[PDB]
Write a protein that binds this ligand. Sequence first.
Ligand SMILES: Nc1ncnc2c1ncn2[C@@H]1O[C@H](COP(=O)(O)OP(=O)(O)O)[C@@H](O)[C@H]1O
Ligand SMILES: Nc1ncnc2c1ncn2[C@@H]1O[C@H](COP(=O)(O)OP(=O)(O)O)[C@@H](O)[C@H]1O
Ligand SMILES: Nc1ncnc2c1ncn2[C@@H]1O[C@H](COP(=O)(O)OP(=O)(O)O)[C@@H](O)[C@H]1O
Lengths: 601, 338, 406
Amino acid sequence: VKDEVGIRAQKLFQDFLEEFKEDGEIKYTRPAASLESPDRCTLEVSFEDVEKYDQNLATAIIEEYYHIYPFLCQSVSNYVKDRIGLKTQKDCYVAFTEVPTRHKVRDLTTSKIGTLIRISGQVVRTHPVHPELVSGVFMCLDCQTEIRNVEQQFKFTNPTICRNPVCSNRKRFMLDVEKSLFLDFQKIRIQETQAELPRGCIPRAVEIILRSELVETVQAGDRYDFTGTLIVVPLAGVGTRAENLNYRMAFLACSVQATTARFGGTDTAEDMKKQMTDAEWHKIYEMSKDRNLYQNLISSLFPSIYGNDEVKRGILLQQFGGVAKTTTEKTSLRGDINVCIVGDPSTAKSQFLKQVSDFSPRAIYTSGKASSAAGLTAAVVRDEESFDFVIEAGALMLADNGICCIDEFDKMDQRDQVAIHEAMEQQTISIARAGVRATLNARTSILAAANPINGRYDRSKSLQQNIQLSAPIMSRFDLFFILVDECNEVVDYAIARKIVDLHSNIEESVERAYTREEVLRYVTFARQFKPVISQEAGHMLVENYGHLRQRDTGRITVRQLESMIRLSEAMAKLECSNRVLERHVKEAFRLLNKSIIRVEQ
Amino acid sequence: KDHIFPPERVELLQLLAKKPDIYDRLARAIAPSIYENDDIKKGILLQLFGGTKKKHATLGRQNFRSEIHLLLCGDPGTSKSQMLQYVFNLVPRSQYTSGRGSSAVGLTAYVTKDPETRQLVLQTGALVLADNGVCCIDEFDKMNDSTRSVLHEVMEQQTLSIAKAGIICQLNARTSILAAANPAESQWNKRKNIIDNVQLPHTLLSRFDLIFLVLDPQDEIFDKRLASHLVSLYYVTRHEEEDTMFDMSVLRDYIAYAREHLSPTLSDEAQQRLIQAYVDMRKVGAGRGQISAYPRQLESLIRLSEAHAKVRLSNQVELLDVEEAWRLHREALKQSAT
Amino acid sequence: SDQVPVGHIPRSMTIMCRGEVTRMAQPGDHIVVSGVFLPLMRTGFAQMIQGLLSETFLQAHRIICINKNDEISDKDAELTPEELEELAQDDFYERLATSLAPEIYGHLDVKKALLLLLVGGVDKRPDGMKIRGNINICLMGDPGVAKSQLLGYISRLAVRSQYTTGRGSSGVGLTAAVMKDPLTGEMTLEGGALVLADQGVCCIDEFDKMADQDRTAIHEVMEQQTISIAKAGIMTTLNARVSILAAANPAFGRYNPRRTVEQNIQLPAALLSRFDLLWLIQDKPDRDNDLRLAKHITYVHSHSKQPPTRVKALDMNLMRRYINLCKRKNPTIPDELTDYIVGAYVELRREARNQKDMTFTSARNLLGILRLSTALARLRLSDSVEKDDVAEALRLLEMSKDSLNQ
DNA sequence: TCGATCGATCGAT
DNA sequence: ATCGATCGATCGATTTTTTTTTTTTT
Ligand SMILES: Nc1ncnc2c1ncn2[C@@H]1O[C@H](COP(=O)(O)OP(=O)(O)O)[C@@H](O)[C@H]1O
Ligand SMILES: Nc1ncnc2c1ncn2[C@@H]1O[C@H](COP(=O)(O)OP(=O)(O)O)[C@@H](O)[C@H]1O
Ligand SMILES: Nc1ncnc2c1ncn2[C@@H]1O[C@H](COP(=O)(O)OP(=O)(O)O)[C@@H](O)[C@H]1O
């Protein structure tokens, strides 16, 4: 038989990796060591290592794959048996990788079978789990039915003659759903590649399959690097017919690199609370004790920008923490909060935020007037695909525990916006007309992008008439910090000499003091702290608010207060410290008063 | 890869390049015989010579592409649809639908059922097929309000991200626009500037680079020259290689080859003039309901600058380009002195 | 559809024309078939079928189509000798003019130019670009003009014609469609009225209330031989080389004292641009023309023939060949007047340009005036387009606009 | 018209 | 002379889809 050569080859492959595999070290047993407890039946292998040590089994492996394929499960079994008290439960999942050649849909013919070639595309119209009792037990009905046979075949067939007796061969025994083989997969389609964009023809569709451990770690909207194990697939085909039949095309693949959709959260190789959550103690110790850290942080993300220096100290607000405290079932207590921007025409209103989406993860930005009023709700459908009314999504709600800001905050219809009138505080939204008593939840902050009425700031009218909209909304936005335009040559020449160091291709920016990665990781470490309040400011904020409204004794009240204590508990999160202090108070009070007197005429 | 040239063609290519006449020769040689308003095609060559690549493999910041968009707008008598159907027979990545040709959804996400798979599929768009290319557009002011807030996304972010009950998508698409808008009348009304005539906002009108105004030649005198020459054109039914030597296809590689081996760069040149004159250039505070100069112009200006420095193949920036760039701008930036 | 019962519906029958008579019929031939009726056994399921009900069919051998076939139409018009006796027998043009729908008087200048629509005949491949020679004009204003009369008449006399109205057919009724095929079952595409009326004229009436998206459907024929559909939406390519006989009505009112074109009419002005001749028919009170037509049309009813003893209007049948003979000339163009055709375009574009806000005057006029003088010379059959040849076309377009001065 | 049913039949044993 | 395998006469079992008229929401 063919594959005995592959048996001996992977035998001595085992026998080598039985010893070291790499410099007295092993990279293909410790996966098996983690496997050894649950026995999940996967161990992926590099194909490059086949090119390292086994000396070109590619042309041994890469053409007659399918017939060699099952022998490698027995290879895997002969591996796992060598050291563990072993039953034949062992099985073969594979997630092949490290293969150089990466081709497309078009280089496909009848000569391309039993290979491992690599392909990409996009994910569409995906389909669910769909189990399979692939196996069981089946023979005659007298006594001798214990059949561990090959009945897992694609075309499935009850009929088996016998093992022990001479008996019927058309009367089956019944089936086994108890002590048998079952497995799991799913099924999708994939469209023509966007990395391979030809003209003319359609997006030719491919059928495509995944195994169990491959399942449900793909998703819509992703580009891939798969296996190439095209297969024989078990009207209008009016060719000649024989027998001692008209097939279509199909395909499967057993390896995934679902890249371009991966961040990984937070895990200086040192000791810490967790593995790598803040292993950079060596520097984060300094990043939590410096006294000018506030300004050094302020100027650490806007070197390519120059304007006011007041939201370069505030907007860290939005990315910064809230509370996350331990309370009873009174109600939701909230952590993050609004911000607003208005400004004259294009003082870089948009480049603040066009980048911020690229800055932190989970927080994708766009506008909703890019589409219908399906920003809040999903696309309202009234034709039959499954049950004639399917609205369970949107675009605003695609930012859960992250932000999704807007541009052109003013010209948007008062449906999404009147829904925003509630959706930001009692952060639970509902609808009718297609809702299975619709109960959603958004959670997150916002950033505004208003534009005045006439496109100028002529102080002839109150702010609430400088915009002349509906009112109550302009309180829950707890800070505005408007950018002003003037006419002074010094500023604009400073801007042009920013462009002096945007394209002078060597050293086309200014020096810095703090790099970004350390900043972001310090930020994502600063949340998990369980802050504390035991401070006389906590006792003595009553007079601070009373003084605030002594100034307001000449809109009003305690929404702003809620903000206040959260702005300042955030600015103490910035001190990498629990145990609230009475100075973050005074800064927050100053920010409050800047906002209100900025609102003042 | 399938169009890499031999070095012998570089002779004729750079031979064309070596003369200042090249700025005018190709501008003259686009059309078959149309010999009026050649003042504009000399700017259209800046899109035919399809812009610069200040690549962003550096820091990941700001995605400031050499984003070029320029449009024409005037009467329907001018050969905008005709010229641009010919431009379809020039540009490689030629697309041609138009205002009320297909909606936003008529341009993106042709999502529907297919009997081939016999299953429902997340599916195609139109713009994204023309990445880096062109789509000639006509009769712009007939499109639905749902559309034309789509183009805001591309023109001002140069991106696209899509999310329906099926997939959520973050594709890639970017290109330069051409279009041939028309008003709600036959003629642009005098004493009624484009600031309000066509159907767009108070400052997004001017938000394109510069709309090169077009209108019928309001002059009977010109009619005879074309009515004679361009009917004799038919009457003889072949062409002649006069002083503006039309190269049959050797002209086309000077377009082809000049996207790849070039990287315009600035030494000291195209910054300092407006950096000097910014006081009187930025006294723009005056005006009752007007639109005028803003500090975005120099982005577009550096774009046009390194564009015209690409022609002549000046790897370092051209200084002459600034002059005809200023010409290009102030050719149509006080059409409303009023 | 002439002998159907009074309160019934048209029926049909099937053919199996065997032997050596395949390709002995076309869609639109009032044929006369002679064969043998026979029964038919559609063998199959013994319950629905096998009921002894006899789903019959036909058999035949001989197809002598007595209407619009090889027999009644000769040349299966170019046969010169048989027509020469009448050819030199008469020499006039207006005699062929008012012989078209000769049951009223009035609207003389419309009929002759319409007759230009039937002939055309300007075909070439100059510079690879093909020029369409099918005139497409409309009719505007209908407080009683007999708009549907010229259409219904000329659609009869004009070989291979059609007729539809606003809500008489959907978009697929105008364009292609699909149906199972008794020959093969291929599920092929079958087209609508405009799909088949090519090489001729498809007539439409009451254009405005046709449909909203239909205007693009007619915008597409102005780039001739181009019927692009989205039925399957793959290519939907098709070669329609039809003319168009447009005709629609004004909205509430007829050129209100303040209203203008595109104000009183609510049609796509871009669509209004793509015509060669615009035609509006407005009749204000004429205190002595009404009695003229009253005696004109009342004699349509006491008898069955209008023109008495003033001229010999021609038979339709001789008309059919007399129009076909003019087509085959394809003359040249006179350069000796090319110097002045441009001057004619000068006065054309100027005497309409002397005012600021008169209706549009287009640059395609010089591409249009050339296309009519050729077909007009086709009925000369001479290749002798003269200086007075376009002298009628100049007043033709001259009056085509400025129809409200008085 | 297709399929298994059942009963009969022809060499082995 | 007993019994299993193969042939062949005998039995019963399958054959319904493309427009329209109200309805909710943009
Ligand atoms: N202080 C500044 N720092 C950096 N860029 C600035 C500054 N002030 C103005 N700008 C410029 O102003 C432009 C604003 O454009 P933008 O507001 O994004 O357009 P839109 O209003 O269409 O969103 C930016 O591209 C930027 O180059
Ligand atoms: N300067 C010109 N050169 C060439 N053709 C012209 C010129 N001015 C007007 N035309 C005419 O304009 C027509 C093309 O106009 P087109 O672009 O199709 O109009 P629209 O774009 O409004 O549909 C041609 O038939 C041509 O005769
Ligand atoms: N002078 C006339 N001579 C002959 N028939 C006329 C005359 N004036 C009016 N009619 C009649 O007026 C009718 C006009 O109908 P028509 O205008 O075609 O309807 P629509 O306005 O819907 O097109 C004709 O059918 C014709 O019988």
